[PDB]
Design a protein around this ligand. Structure first.
Ligand code: MG
Ligand code: MG
Lengths: 119, 57, 238, 49
RNA sequence: CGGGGGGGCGAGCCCCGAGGGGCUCUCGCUUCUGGCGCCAAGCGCCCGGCCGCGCGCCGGCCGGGCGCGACCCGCUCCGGGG
RNA sequence: CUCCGUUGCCCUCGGCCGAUCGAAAGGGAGUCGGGUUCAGAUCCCCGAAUCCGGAGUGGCGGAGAUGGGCGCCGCGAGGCGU
């Protein structure tokens, strides 16, 4: 005597368990391929890019094409012990992703050019 | 204003402060009031006339 | 007055169109899924149709008073469980190489379970009683058995529940069962059942063999057909 | 209702049973004015609509 | 839904004692007005704690649970064919 | 382990309506002046903005919200008890 108020039968909601696999299904976890040496390929040194460094506190980077801005930002930060105001990406007709990276005002591009070797 | 904009606006821009405020138009509320008597009262008048018909019968 | 004036009544009325209707049980006004609907109207057909004798006999069965003696009787007598089996062997392995053992003992009398086991030892007249489950799924497997049993003059019987018959022998289900021998002391109770059973079965056959058992309509139809015989009685009985 | 000579009428009853309001579409009988209560079913009285 | 059964304001008939009962009907109760109407009141019966009387299924305070309300049984989810 | 969070199970409630795609012209919140290049500019910069989401611990104000009565004590502003 648990009466039926509704005139449908809806399936009873059963218990359903969580995977307790007897092995892992692949041995090891895949080594991460988008790194803080791989996501950035090279800084550009084009005249319209030197002009962009000196005048706008930016750096012009070619970047690995699967990169996001929060990846390009935690890359450029990690490496040229820098910090980044904002990233701003395009895809060159060629498939190379550019990303020109504004560096916070406390902090200069024209110095960090000579550190990374460009100029 | 275009409806998604209503999410920005304050409560008071979207109603007027009443019964059925901001959905219904005064003129229909104040009939809904004085309809809601006379429906109610004349169930009472039928209630007593029924009671008198069964008191007679 | 220990009765606050406010708690009133507000008694509702669920006439058509008056106050909104409440929640009754609807078990007949509900959508019975395709297994249920189906199994429901197997049981209906299986009464509605004209069922054959041989399949009917698998309705009429034992009663509490008889059944419970049977299943008492068997409980002295269930075939060795596993574990219980192991120590029948293990004890003879230690008793053989210690304090003598020819090792035939005396195999104590027990049940006999399946059909093509039973039917052989019914066809051999090696059975005092045979218990048959009624609800067996392909009925094929036990249609004959009663006929066979009465020809050999072997007391057969039809107990309810292939489960509770298949719980004696330690399984899910079982269709038949049999006592070939009994312990001497336990033979008064066996011969008590046997005589009680075969008044009721083996010596009935021309009552069972010619009894069709369905052809029963639905009570909704029956209530209507009978309500026309109060019209036809009360036309020219008045 | 396009491609159809008769006008329809939306008539809101209410579900005798769930707190709600079923609405339907009757083919408008002539003399259906807007604001009519339309009585339906066995015991209903014999008038238009 | 089909049977049953409650109800009962009421009609026919039957009974009747004039209280009433039985059988039949009726209902199953929403029609003058672009009104409101769900998640339950009420009664009942219980149990937990806590407080008071102290016998505590006495009484209060706090907190729950089931029954009626919302008759009972079934065998085809309702309808029309065949 | 306070309180809160998280999860486990137990009870409770939920009609829908079709696994899914379909607009660079239909539906769809919110960015614009000025500046700048050889080529790009509501895209870069300067300044003014704005939407959506998050804000828990609540970041800070303001509302909820600060009476009245009664009773005392105080000249009176007033203080306290309830
Ligand atoms: Mg799409
Ligand atoms: Mg568009």
């Amino acid at each position: 005597k648990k009466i039926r108020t509704s005139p449908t039968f809806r399936r009873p909601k059963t218990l359903r368990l969580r995977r307790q696999p007897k092995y892992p299904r692949k041995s090891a976890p895949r080594r991460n391929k988008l790194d803080h040496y791989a996501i950035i390929k090279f800084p550009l040194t084009t005249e319209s890019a030197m002009k962009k460094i000196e005048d706008n506190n930016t750096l012009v980077f070619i970047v690995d094409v699967k990169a996001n801005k929060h990846q390009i930002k935690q890359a450029v930060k990690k490496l040229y012990d820098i910090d980044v105001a904002k990233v701003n990406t395009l895809i060159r007709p060629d498939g190379e992703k550019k990303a020109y990276v504004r560096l916070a005002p406390d902090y200069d591009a024209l110095d960090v050019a000579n550190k990374i070797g460009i100029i | 204003v275009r409806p998604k904009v209503l999410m920005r606006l304050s409560k008071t821009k979207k109603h007027v402060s009443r019964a059925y405020g901001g959905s219904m138009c005064a003129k229909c509320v104040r009939d809904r009031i004085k309809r809601a008597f006379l429906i109610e009262e004349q169930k009472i008048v039928v209630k007593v006339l029924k009671a008198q018909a069964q008191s007679q019968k | 007055k220990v009765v606050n004036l406010l708690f009133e009544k507000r008694p509702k009325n669920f006439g058509i169109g008056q106050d909104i209707q409440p929640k009754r049980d609807l078990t007949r006004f509900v959508k019975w899924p395709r297994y249920i609907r189906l199994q429901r109207q197997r049981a209906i057909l299986y009464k509605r149709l004209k069922v054959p004798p041989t399949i009917n006999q698998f309705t009429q069965a034992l009663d509490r008073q008889t059944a419970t003696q049977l299943l008492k009787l068997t409980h002295k007598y269930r075939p060795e469980t596993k574990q219980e089996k192991k120590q029948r062997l293990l004890a003879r392995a230690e008793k053989k190489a210690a304090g003598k053992g020819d090792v035939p003992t005396k195999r104590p009398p027990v049940l006999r379970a399946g059909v093509n086991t039973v039917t052989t030892l019914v066809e051999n007249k090696k059975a005092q009683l045979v218990v048959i489950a009624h609800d067996v799924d392909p009925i094929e497997l036990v249609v004959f058995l009663p006929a066979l049993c009465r020809k050999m003059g072997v007391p057969y019987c039809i107990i309810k529940g292939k489960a509770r018959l298949g719980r004696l022998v330690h399984r899910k289900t079982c269709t038949t069962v049999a006592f070939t021998q009994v312990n001497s002391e336990d033979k008064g109770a066996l011969a008590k059942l046997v005589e009680a059973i075969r008044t009721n079965y083996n010596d009935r056959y021309n009552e069972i063999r010619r009894h069709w058992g369905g052809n029963v309509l639905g009570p909704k139809s029956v209530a209507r057909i009978t309500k026309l015989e109060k019209a036809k009685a009360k036309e020219l009985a008045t | 209702d396009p491609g159809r000579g008769a006008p329809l009428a939306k008539v809101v009853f209410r579900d005798p049973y769930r707190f709600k309001k079923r609405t339907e579409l009757f083919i408008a009988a002539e003399g259906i004015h807007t604001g009519q209560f339309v009585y339906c079913g066995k015991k209903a009285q014999l008038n238009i609509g």
